[PDB]
Amino acid sequence: VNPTVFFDIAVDGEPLGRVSFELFADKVPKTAENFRALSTGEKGFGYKGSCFHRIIPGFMCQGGDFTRHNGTGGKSIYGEKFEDENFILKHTGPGILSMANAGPNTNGSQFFICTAKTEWLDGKHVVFGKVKEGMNIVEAMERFGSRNGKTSKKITIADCGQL
16 A cells, blocks of 8 residues: 655666665655655656765665755755654665755655665654665665765666656
8 A cells, every 4th residue: 555656767878777665655644745746746846857966885875856956955745845744764774765854844855765774863864665676776876976975977867656
C-alpha cells in the first residue's frame, strides 16, 4: 500500500540505472506525498531533469534542488517550506531516504540517500523512505563524489515517476 517511486539516473547523459524507493506513507504521509508528487511531476514541477549536487562517499547522496541546482533552492508542494512531520523513523543504515533542511520546520524538496548509518541526524531530519531496488546503482553514483561533495560528472535524474 505504500507507494513506490523510481529514478532513472544518468551520468553525463549516459544511462547508469534505476533506483526505486518505498515511501513510508503509513508513518509520514505528508512528507511521503511531497516526494511522490515531485517524482511524478503532477503539480507541474518536480525532480525530472534535476541533479544530485552533493555526493560524499561513505556518507550520503544529496539532491532535489530543482530550481538552483546547488543546494540553495527547491520548494515543496505545500509552499516554500513545511514542518517536520515526526521523527518516528531513524537513520539506521544505508538506503535510508531523509529530508534535508536548514533548521526546524524548513523542509522543501531536497533530500538525501544515506550510504552509511547516520545516527547523529536522528530527531533532526525526517526519515520517510528507503531504497527498495537498485542500491547497487546508489553505490555506483557514490563513486562520482568526493570528500567536499563536488561531483566529477553530472549526475541527473533523467526520468522519474511512480511504479
